[PDB]
Design an enzyme around this catalytic site. Structure first.
Site, PDB file in Angstrom:
ATOM      1  N   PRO A 123      56.096  93.465   4.705  1.00 54.59           N
ATOM      2  CA  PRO A 123      57.185  94.440   4.486  1.00 54.59           C
ATOM      3  C   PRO A 123      56.691  95.883   4.400  1.00 54.59           C
ATOM      4  CG  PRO A 123      56.758  93.320   2.460  1.00 54.59           C
ATOM      5  CD  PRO A 123      56.030  92.534   3.561  1.00 54.59           C
ATOM      6  N   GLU A 124      57.588  96.822   4.687  1.00 59.10           N
ATOM      7  CA  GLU A 124      57.266  98.241   4.627  1.00 59.10           C
ATOM      8  C   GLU A 124      58.061  98.831   3.459  1.00 59.10           C
ATOM      9  OE1 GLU A 124      57.323 100.056   8.691  1.00 59.10           O
ATOM     10  OE2 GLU A 124      57.236  97.989   9.415  1.00 59.10           O
TER      11      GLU A 124
ATOM     12  N   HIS B 178      53.260  76.906  -0.314  1.00 55.87           N
ATOM     13  CA  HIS B 178      52.495  78.156  -0.306  1.00 55.87           C
ATOM     14  C   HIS B 178      52.670  79.051  -1.541  1.00 55.87           C
ATOM     15  CE1 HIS B 178      53.218  76.972   3.968  1.00 55.87           C
ATOM     16  NE2 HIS B 178      51.904  77.106   3.997  1.00 55.87           N
TER      17      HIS B 178
ATOM     18  N   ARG C 191      50.137  83.480   4.700  1.00 54.45           N
ATOM     19  CA  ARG C 191      48.849  83.896   5.247  1.00 54.45           C
ATOM     20  C   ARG C 191      47.779  84.244   4.212  1.00 54.45           C
ATOM     21  NH1 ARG C 191      49.858  87.886  10.267  1.00 54.45           N
ATOM     22  NH2 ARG C 191      47.705  87.243  10.739  1.00 54.45           N
TER      23      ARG C 191
END
Ligand SMILES: [Zn+2]
Length: 259
Positions: A1-2, A92, A111
DNA sequence: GTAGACGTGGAC
DNA sequence: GTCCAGTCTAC
Protein backbone atom coordinates in the site's frame (compact mmCIF):
# COMPACT_ATOMS: atom_id res chain seq x y z
CA UNK A 1 0.00 0.00 0.00
CA UNK A 2 0.92 3.66 -0.52
CA UNK A 3 -0.03 6.74 1.55
CA UNK A 4 -3.76 6.60 0.67
CA UNK A 5 -4.18 2.92 1.56
CA UNK A 6 -2.18 3.27 4.79
CA UNK A 7 -4.12 6.41 5.78
CA UNK A 8 -7.36 4.48 5.23
CA UNK A 9 -6.07 1.68 7.47
CA UNK A 10 -5.12 4.18 10.20
CA UNK A 11 -8.60 5.72 10.25
CA UNK A 12 -10.62 2.50 10.47
CA UNK A 13 -8.24 0.67 12.80
CA UNK A 14 -7.91 3.33 15.52
CA UNK A 15 -11.43 3.03 17.03
CA UNK A 16 -11.10 -0.77 17.10
CA UNK A 17 -8.00 -0.71 19.32
CA UNK A 18 -7.80 2.57 21.25
CA UNK A 19 -7.97 2.11 25.02
CA UNK A 20 -7.19 -1.62 24.94
CA UNK A 21 -4.35 -3.07 27.07
CA UNK A 22 -1.82 -5.62 25.77
CA UNK A 23 -1.70 -8.95 27.62
CA UNK A 24 0.52 -10.98 25.29
CA UNK A 25 2.45 -10.70 22.01
CA UNK A 26 2.97 -13.81 19.87
CA UNK A 27 5.43 -14.01 16.97
CA UNK A 28 5.36 -16.74 14.31
CA UNK A 29 7.99 -15.26 11.94
CA UNK A 30 10.88 -13.45 13.82
CA UNK A 31 12.43 -11.79 10.75
CA UNK A 32 9.64 -9.18 10.76
CA UNK A 33 10.90 -7.88 14.14
CA UNK A 34 13.76 -5.42 13.46
CA UNK A 35 14.14 -3.64 16.82
CA UNK A 36 14.83 -4.74 19.38
CA UNK A 37 16.47 -7.58 17.45
CA UNK A 38 15.48 -10.25 19.98
CA UNK A 39 11.80 -11.10 19.46
CA UNK A 40 11.46 -12.15 23.11
CA UNK A 41 12.48 -8.67 24.26
CA UNK A 42 10.11 -7.10 21.69
CA UNK A 43 7.20 -9.11 23.11
CA UNK A 44 7.98 -8.56 26.81
CA UNK A 45 8.32 -4.76 26.68
CA UNK A 46 4.82 -4.16 25.27
CA UNK A 47 2.98 -6.33 27.80
CA UNK A 48 0.95 -4.11 30.12
CA UNK A 49 0.92 -1.02 27.88
CA UNK A 50 -2.34 0.48 26.62
CA UNK A 51 -2.99 1.71 23.05
CA UNK A 52 -3.39 5.51 23.24
CA UNK A 53 -3.37 6.44 19.56
CA UNK A 54 -2.42 5.69 15.96
CA UNK A 55 -0.66 8.01 13.51
CA UNK A 56 0.87 7.78 10.03
CA UNK A 57 4.19 9.08 8.64
CA UNK A 58 4.81 8.42 4.96
CA UNK A 59 3.85 4.79 4.36
CA UNK A 60 4.46 3.88 8.05
CA UNK A 61 1.90 3.33 10.80
CA UNK A 62 2.87 4.49 14.29
CA UNK A 63 1.04 2.78 17.14
CA UNK A 64 1.30 5.02 20.23
CA UNK A 65 1.29 3.12 23.54
CA UNK A 66 2.12 4.27 27.09
CA UNK A 67 5.89 4.62 26.90
CA UNK A 68 6.68 3.14 23.47
CA UNK A 69 5.74 3.67 19.86
CA UNK A 70 5.48 0.67 17.50
CA UNK A 71 6.57 1.59 13.95
CA UNK A 72 5.13 -0.74 11.29
CA UNK A 73 5.74 -0.85 7.52
CA UNK A 74 3.43 -3.12 5.49
CA UNK A 75 5.69 -3.15 2.42
CA UNK A 76 3.92 -5.05 -0.37
CA UNK A 77 1.15 -7.14 1.23
CA UNK A 78 1.02 -6.66 5.00
CA UNK A 79 -2.46 -6.21 6.52
CA UNK A 80 -4.16 -5.73 9.92
CA UNK A 81 -7.45 -7.03 11.33
CA UNK A 82 -9.14 -7.08 14.75
CA UNK A 83 -11.04 -10.18 15.87
CA UNK A 84 -11.88 -12.58 18.71
CA UNK A 85 -8.97 -14.51 20.21
CA UNK A 86 -11.26 -17.55 20.39
CA UNK A 87 -11.51 -18.06 16.61
CA UNK A 88 -8.87 -19.77 14.42
CA UNK A 89 -6.27 -17.56 12.73
CA UNK A 90 -6.26 -16.90 8.98
CA UNK A 91 -3.40 -18.15 6.76
CA UNK A 92 -0.10 -16.22 6.85
CA UNK A 93 -0.67 -14.60 10.27
CA UNK A 94 2.82 -13.75 11.55
CA UNK A 95 2.36 -11.50 14.60
CA UNK A 96 -0.56 -11.23 17.06
CA UNK A 97 -1.24 -8.72 19.86
CA UNK A 98 -3.64 -10.11 22.47
CA UNK A 99 -5.62 -7.65 24.60
CA UNK A 100 -7.04 -8.06 28.12
CA UNK A 101 -10.63 -7.97 26.81
CA UNK A 102 -10.26 -11.16 24.77
CA UNK A 103 -9.87 -9.36 21.43
CA UNK A 104 -6.68 -9.31 19.34
CA UNK A 105 -4.87 -7.37 16.59
CA UNK A 106 -3.54 -9.72 13.91
CA UNK A 107 -0.84 -8.96 11.33
CA UNK A 108 -0.84 -10.96 8.05
CA UNK A 109 1.78 -10.75 5.27
CA UNK A 110 1.93 -13.35 2.49
CA UNK A 111 5.36 -12.29 1.21
CA UNK A 112 6.80 -11.66 4.69
CA UNK A 113 8.44 -8.37 3.71
CA UNK A 114 6.99 -6.11 6.44
CA UNK A 115 8.95 -4.69 9.40
CA UNK A 116 8.35 -3.62 13.04
CA UNK A 117 10.52 -1.30 15.20
CA UNK A 118 9.83 -0.39 18.86
CA UNK A 119 11.35 2.70 20.51
CA UNK A 120 10.49 5.03 23.37
CA UNK A 121 8.04 7.65 22.06
CA UNK A 122 10.50 10.55 22.19
CA UNK A 123 13.17 8.66 20.23
CA UNK A 124 11.10 7.21 17.36
CA UNK A 125 11.22 10.24 15.04
CA UNK A 126 15.00 10.52 15.47
CA UNK A 127 15.93 6.89 14.79
CA UNK A 128 15.54 4.80 11.64
CA UNK A 129 13.40 4.03 9.75
CA UNK A 130 11.60 7.36 10.31
CA UNK A 131 14.71 9.52 10.77
CA UNK A 132 15.44 10.58 7.18
CA UNK A 133 11.92 10.76 5.71
CA UNK A 134 10.88 13.69 3.52
CA UNK A 135 7.92 16.00 4.28
CA UNK A 136 4.26 14.99 4.17
CA UNK A 137 2.79 15.85 0.72
CA UNK A 138 -0.41 17.23 2.22
CA UNK A 139 1.49 19.68 4.43
CA UNK A 140 2.95 23.19 3.97
CA UNK A 141 6.38 21.57 4.32
CA UNK A 142 6.05 20.16 0.79
CA UNK A 143 6.15 22.85 -1.90
CA UNK A 144 7.42 23.40 -5.46
CA UNK A 145 10.58 24.90 -3.97
CA UNK A 146 11.39 21.71 -2.08
CA UNK A 147 10.73 19.64 -5.19
CA UNK A 148 12.79 22.00 -7.36
CA UNK A 149 15.71 22.03 -4.90
CA UNK A 150 16.04 18.25 -5.18
CA UNK A 151 15.17 18.11 -8.90
CA UNK A 152 17.75 20.64 -10.09
CA UNK A 153 20.52 18.66 -8.38
CA UNK A 154 20.26 15.14 -9.80
CA UNK A 155 20.51 13.45 -13.19
CA UNK A 156 18.14 10.55 -12.53
CA UNK A 157 14.62 10.27 -13.98
CA UNK A 158 11.73 12.21 -12.49
CA UNK A 159 9.99 8.96 -11.50
CA UNK A 160 13.04 7.89 -9.48
CA UNK A 161 13.02 11.25 -7.73
CA UNK A 162 9.37 10.83 -6.70
CA UNK A 163 9.81 7.26 -5.45
CA UNK A 164 12.59 8.48 -3.11
CA UNK A 165 11.03 8.77 0.36
CA UNK A 166 13.69 11.31 1.47
CA UNK A 167 12.41 13.80 -1.13
CA UNK A 168 8.73 13.46 -0.23
CA UNK A 169 7.07 10.69 1.81
CA UNK A 170 4.17 8.51 0.69
CA UNK A 171 4.32 8.01 -3.09
CA UNK A 172 4.60 4.60 -4.72
CA UNK A 173 4.30 3.09 -8.20
CA UNK A 174 0.59 3.78 -8.62
CA UNK A 175 0.45 7.42 -7.55
CA UNK A 176 3.78 8.41 -9.13
CA UNK A 177 2.57 7.14 -12.54
CA UNK A 178 -0.84 8.79 -12.09
CA UNK A 179 0.59 12.14 -10.92
CA UNK A 180 3.00 12.33 -13.87
CA UNK A 181 0.18 11.68 -16.36
CA UNK A 182 -2.09 14.34 -14.87
CA UNK A 183 0.85 16.77 -14.97
CA UNK A 184 1.71 15.71 -18.53
CA UNK A 185 5.32 14.60 -17.98
CA UNK A 186 7.08 11.47 -19.30
CA UNK A 187 8.30 9.27 -16.39
CA UNK A 188 11.70 8.51 -17.93
CA UNK A 189 12.95 12.05 -18.49
CA UNK A 190 15.79 13.65 -16.44
CA UNK A 191 14.50 15.33 -13.29
CA UNK A 192 16.91 18.17 -14.05
CA UNK A 193 15.24 18.85 -17.42
CA UNK A 194 11.94 19.91 -15.84
CA UNK A 195 11.18 23.63 -16.13
CA UNK A 196 9.81 25.86 -13.37
CA UNK A 197 6.30 25.67 -14.84
CA UNK A 198 6.46 21.87 -14.94
CA UNK A 199 7.63 21.51 -11.33
CA UNK A 200 4.78 23.70 -10.07
CA UNK A 201 2.34 21.71 -12.21
CA UNK A 202 3.70 18.42 -10.86
CA UNK A 203 3.47 19.63 -7.26
CA UNK A 204 -0.13 20.64 -7.92
CA UNK A 205 -1.12 17.27 -9.38
CA UNK A 206 0.73 15.28 -6.72
CA UNK A 207 -1.21 17.02 -3.93
CA UNK A 208 -4.53 16.72 -5.78
CA UNK A 209 -4.04 13.03 -6.64
CA UNK A 210 -3.02 11.90 -3.16
CA UNK A 211 -5.77 14.07 -1.72
CA UNK A 212 -8.53 12.59 -3.89
CA UNK A 213 -7.22 9.06 -3.33
CA UNK A 214 -7.46 9.42 0.45
CA UNK A 215 -11.05 10.65 0.07
CA UNK A 216 -12.02 7.54 -1.92
CA UNK A 217 -10.43 5.11 0.54
CA UNK A 218 -7.44 4.22 -1.62
CA UNK A 219 -7.23 1.90 -4.62
CA UNK A 220 -10.05 5.15 -6.47
CA UNK A 221 -9.09 2.40 -8.91
CA UNK A 222 -11.99 3.57 -11.10
CA UNK A 223 -10.24 6.93 -11.40
CA UNK A 224 -6.94 5.58 -12.74
CA UNK A 225 -5.72 7.05 -16.02
CA UNK A 226 -2.67 4.86 -16.64
CA UNK A 227 -1.71 2.32 -13.95
CA UNK A 228 -2.53 -1.19 -15.13
CA UNK A 229 -4.28 0.07 -18.28
CA UNK A 230 -1.60 -0.89 -20.82
CA UNK A 231 -3.10 -1.68 -24.21
CA UNK A 232 -6.29 0.24 -23.43
CA UNK A 233 -7.20 3.67 -24.86
CA UNK A 234 -6.28 6.82 -22.93
CA UNK A 235 -9.34 8.30 -21.21
CA UNK A 236 -8.31 11.73 -22.48
CA UNK A 237 -7.01 11.25 -26.06
CA UNK A 238 -7.69 7.62 -26.98
CA UNK A 239 -4.05 6.72 -27.72
CA UNK A 240 -3.19 3.20 -26.45
CA UNK A 241 -1.57 3.26 -23.01
CA UNK A 242 1.96 1.84 -22.97
CA UNK A 243 4.06 0.02 -20.37
CA UNK A 244 7.85 -0.19 -19.99
CA UNK A 245 10.51 -0.26 -17.26
CA UNK A 246 11.83 2.88 -15.53
CA UNK A 247 13.93 3.04 -12.36
CA UNK A 248 13.72 -0.75 -12.25
CA UNK A 249 9.92 -0.98 -12.17
CA UNK A 250 6.80 -1.34 -14.32
CA UNK A 251 5.86 2.11 -15.63
CA UNK A 252 2.60 3.20 -17.31
CA UNK A 253 2.06 6.30 -19.47
CA UNK A 254 0.40 7.86 -22.55
CA UNK A 255 2.90 8.81 -25.31
CA UNK A 256 0.69 11.69 -26.49
CA UNK A 257 -0.55 13.34 -23.27
CA UNK A 258 2.88 13.09 -21.63
CA UNK A 259 5.93 14.89 -23.02
C1' DG B 1 20.66 3.98 -12.21
C1' DT B 2 19.37 -0.74 -13.68
C1' DA B 3 18.71 -5.82 -12.06
C1' DG B 4 18.51 -8.89 -8.43
C1' DA B 5 17.38 -9.93 -3.23
C1' DC B 6 13.93 -11.20 0.33
C1' DG B 7 8.71 -15.42 0.60
C1' DT B 8 4.63 -16.63 -1.71
C1' DG B 9 0.86 -17.09 -5.10
C1' DG B 10 -1.98 -15.93 -9.36
C1' DA B 11 -2.05 -15.18 -14.56
C1' DC B 12 -0.95 -17.29 -19.04
C1' DG C 1 5.88 -23.99 -16.02
C1' DT C 2 7.17 -18.97 -15.79
C1' DC C 3 6.92 -13.55 -15.68
C1' DC C 4 5.14 -9.79 -12.47
C1' DA C 5 4.21 -7.33 -7.83
C1' DG C 6 8.61 -1.43 -0.97
C1' DT C 7 13.28 -0.64 0.42
C1' DC C 8 18.23 -2.69 0.15
C1' DT C 9 22.31 -3.64 -2.09
C1' DA C 10 26.33 -4.94 -4.82
C1' DC C 11 28.23 -5.79 -10.18
ZN1 LIG D 1 -3.54 10.55 -23.78
Amino acid sequence: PELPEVETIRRTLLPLIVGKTIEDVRIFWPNIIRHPRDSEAFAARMIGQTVRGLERRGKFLKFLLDRDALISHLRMEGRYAVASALEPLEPHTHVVFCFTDGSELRYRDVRKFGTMHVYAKEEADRRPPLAELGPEPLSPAFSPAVLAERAVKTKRSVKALLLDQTVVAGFGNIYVDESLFRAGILPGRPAASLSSKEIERLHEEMVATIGEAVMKGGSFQHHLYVYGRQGNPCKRCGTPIEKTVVAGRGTHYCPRCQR
